[PDB]
Structures are given as structure tokens and as C-alpha cells.
Design an enzyme around this catalytic site. Structure first.
Site, PDB file in Angstrom:
ATOM      1  N   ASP A   1       0.786  -1.240   0.000  1.00  0.00           N
ATOM      2  CA  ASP A   1       0.000   0.000   0.000  1.00  0.00           C
ATOM      3  C   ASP A   1       0.827   1.305   0.000  1.00  0.00           C
ATOM      4  OD1 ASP A   1      -2.126   1.860   0.457  1.00  0.00           O
ATOM      5  OD2 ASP A   1      -2.349   1.318   2.555  1.00  0.00           O
TER       6      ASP A   1
ATOM      7  N   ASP B   1      -2.756   5.519  -4.939  1.00  0.00           N
ATOM      8  CA  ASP B   1      -2.928   4.495  -3.908  1.00  0.00           C
ATOM      9  C   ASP B   1      -3.085   3.036  -4.398  1.00  0.00           C
ATOM     10  OD1 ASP B   1      -3.290   3.326  -1.378  1.00  0.00           O
ATOM     11  OD2 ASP B   1      -5.185   4.353  -0.930  1.00  0.00           O
TER      12      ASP B   1
END
Ligand SMILES: Cc1ccc(S(=O)(=O)N[C@H]2CNC[C@@H](C(=O)NCC(c3ccccc3)c3ccccc3)C2)cc1
Ligand SMILES: *[C@@H]1O[C@H](CO)[C@@H](O)[C@H](O)[C@H]1NC(C)=O
EC number: 3.4.23.15
Length: 337
Positions: free
Chosen positions: A38, A223
Site C-alpha cells: 500500500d 494508492d
């Protein structure tokens, strides 16, 4: 900064086009966990053996047992990590982490409170934050900073490839470079607004030919941890109205038959228009006029300082191979192969 001549890759598994996870090993002998890499966060965490079995998510995931690791170093500092879908809490621990043939001493969180929603829906066990120390809870050094410190990597960059759901490769993360086998043409870089966040400036969002949204400029968080492309509840209401999509509790839908007729969506980043056709944003499960099809674009009100912002997640990365450049504080995009 020291630069070596090594690159390291992690094969990712594609679960339903929403979750992309690879493996890491923690401890001696290694205990393996399925993890999401992430860019929107900076902490490493896995579920703990100290998690009460009254949390059903802990019954359904691999747990880290420090009592079985000979390399474990106690810490115990509490920590809470907030995400979009939910929250996790536990405490800090240190041990050796193996990520694609790279061995690093890493401080990570042992999660003892992991809610069934959303963690019962997760195929992965934990998270590996690819963000900056500025976003790290408890100011813990992020894994990439620790790998950079080793002076093994050829370049101070990492790359993401997310494939479309099929017995093919689910995805790939390259540490120390990019993989020319997974992209075409040339990389076009966008400089970060500031160091500390993988966020760039977005000059407009167009539905069809007309620059319908983000007319006076707006923010774009790149993201890898987000499944979808997201904007503010306001932006998404306007966008969805333009598409003919109707709002459900957790998503927006269109009648399956009307999916292939939806217009292209364009994102103006740096000196390029990054365009998605309806095939890139509609989960086309059927072609039926009697069924509803979900879109890979969701409303998400990201709080400050980071938000309000758009988030370019897996929906975007599938079309555009992404390079995250730590040496030059920029993000490169190239058409994925
Ligand atoms: C309330 C809030 C806090 C923080 C953010 S953020 O945009 O700054 N943080 C994002 C970082 N990347 C992961 C995003 C997320 O929550 N994705 C859902 C996903 C997941 C992935 C990694 C870590 C936690 C959560 C997920 C969870 C469970 C099942 C399937 C996907 C949040 C937005 C809103
Ligand atoms: C936990 O790790 C941090 C890392 O710098 C350290 O400052 C802190 O004192 C540690 N706590 C314990 C109890 O070992």
C-alpha cells in the site's frame, strides 16, 4: 543514499480485481503472510497470535506468533491505524522480514483488534506500507527506507503492475526498478506536490469530451492499497449523474446492458490525458438488461491533511503501469502490457 545493482520482484495474486497481494516471511523460521503493498500508508502490520478468537477475522487469517521466532525483539508500544474501510489496533514488534529475496530487520505492528468488517472480506492477512515516514504512525521507519539503507537496490524506485483478473500473473512489484515486459511506450512523470505523500496535482476530470470536473485543479493520491478510483461524495455525485449511474449503499450501478455504451473518463495529470473506457471501469459480469453491474469508481471522503483528494487505485493502475520514484519525488505512468 547508497545504490547497488540489485532489483527484487514480488509476484502478486489478483483476487477479483479488488485485492492484489504478495507474500512476505516474518521471523526465524519464517511465518508467511499474504500482504497488500500500500502506497497510501507507511506501516507494516500482520494479525497477532495475541488477537482474541472472539475477533472472527483473526480466526480466518494467519497470526504472527513471537514465541516461535528466535529473531523477535520486543517493543510493546501501542498503535492504532486508521484506513478508509475500518481500523486496526495492536502493538509494535521487531523481527526479520523477507520480501522478494531481500532480508530486512523491520519494526511492524502486531494487530490484536481486527474488525470482521472489512477484514472478513480480505483475502490478505496484513499490510506493507510503501508510503513515507511522514505518514507512519509512531514514526516507525517504513520497510522501503530500511531496504534503501542496505545499499543493494539499483535505483531508489519501486514499480507496480496489476493485471486484469484471469492461470496468468496477478501482478508484480519491482523493488529497485521497473519491468519493461509489463509496460509500453515511455514513462511520463508527475512531480509530487510535496515529499511525505504519493500525491500529485490533477488538472481536470472529463466525462466524454467535456472537462466536467476538477476544472480549477485538484489532488490525486496514487494508492496501490485502494481497489477503486475515488473522489469526494460531491465529485462522485456529479460524475455518476453524467454516467446515468444510480447510487446503492456501498456502490453505484448501471444496468448491465448499458455498460459498454458508457463514455470514456479522462484524468489530466502532468502533460497527458489518462483515459479509461467503460471496459476499464465497469465490472461487466453480464450484458443483461435485467441485472445490475457495479463500477470500479466509488465516493470516498479522505480526511485532512491528505484529503479532500481523489485516489487513483487498482482501477487506474491496471491500465497504467506505475513507477514510484523516491530519488526524484515523482510518479511515472506508462501504458500497461
Ligand atoms: C477514513 C480514512 C482514513 C484514511 C484514508 S487514506 O485514503 O489516507 N488511506 C488509504 C490507504 N490505502 C488503503 C485504503 C483502504 O482502506 N483500502 C481498502 C483495503 C485496505 C488495503 C490496505 C490497508 C487497509 C485496507 C481493503 C480492506 C479490506 C478488504 C479489501 C480491501 C485507505 C481514507 C479515509
Ligand atoms: C520501541 O522502538 C522505538 C524505536 O526507535 C524505541 O524508541 C522505543 O523505545 C522502543 N520501546 C521499547 C519498550 O523497546
Amino acid at each position: 543514499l547508497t545504490l547497488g545493482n540489485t532489483t527484487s520482484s514480488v509476484i502478486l495474486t489478483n483476487y477479483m480485481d479488488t485485492q492484489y497481494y504478495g507474500e512476505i516471511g516474518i521471523g526465524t523460521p519464517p511465518q508467511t503472510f499474504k500482504v497488500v503493498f500500500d502506497t497510501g500508508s507507511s506501516n507494516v502490520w500482520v494479525p497477532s497470535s495475541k488477537c482474541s478468537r472472539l475477533y472472527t477475522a483473526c480466526v480466518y487469517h494467519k497470526l504472527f506468533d513471537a514465541s516461535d521466532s528466535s529473531s523477535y525483539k520486543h517493543n510493546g508500544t501501542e498503535l492504532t491505524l486508521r484506513y478508509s474501510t475500518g481500523t486496526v489496533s495492536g502493538f509494535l514488534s521487531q523481527d526479520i522480514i523477507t520480501v522478494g529475496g531481500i532480508t530486512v530487520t523491520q519494526m511492524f505492528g502486531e494487530v490484536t483488534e481486527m474488525p470482521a468488517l472489512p477484514f472478513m472480506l480480505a483475502e490478505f492477512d496484513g499490510v506493507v506500507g510503501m508510503g513515507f515516514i511522514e505518514q507512519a504512525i509512531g514514526r516507525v521507519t517504513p520497510i522501503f527506507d530500511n531496504i534503501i539503507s542496505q545499499g543493494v537496490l539499483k535505483e531508489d524506485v519501486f514499480s507496480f503492475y496489476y493485471n486484469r483478473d484471469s492461470q496468468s500473473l496477478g501482478g508484480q512489484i519491482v523493488l529497485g526498478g521497473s519491468d519493461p515486459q509489463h509496460y509500453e511506450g515511455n514513462f511520463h512523470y508527475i512531480n509530487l506536490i510535496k515529499t511525505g505523500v504519493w500525491q500529485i496535482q490533477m488538472k481536470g476530470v472529463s466525462v466524454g469530451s467535456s472537462t466536467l470536473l476538477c476544472e480549477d485543479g485538484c489532488l490525486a493520491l496514487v494508492d496501490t492499497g485502494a481497489s477503486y478510483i475515488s473522489g469526494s461524495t460531491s465529485s462522485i455525485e456529479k460524475l455518476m449523474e453524467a454516467l446515468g449511474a444510480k447510487k446503492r449503499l456501498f456502490d453505484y450501478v448501471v444496468k448491465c446492458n448499458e455498460g459498454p455504451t458508457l463514455p470514456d473518463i479522462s484524468f489530466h495529470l502532468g502533460g497527458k490525458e489518462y483515459t479509461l473506457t467503460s471496459a476499464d471501469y465497469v465490472f461487466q459480469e453480464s450484458y443483461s438488461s435485467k441485472k445490475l453491474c457495479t463500477l470500479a469508481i466509488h465516493a470516498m471522503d479522505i480526511p485532512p491533511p491528505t484529503g479532500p483528494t481523489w485516489a487513483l487505485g487498482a482501477t487506474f493502475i491496471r491500465k497504467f503501469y506505475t513507477e514510484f520514484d523516491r530519488r526524484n519525488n515523482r510518479i511515472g505512468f506508462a501504458l500497461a502490457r
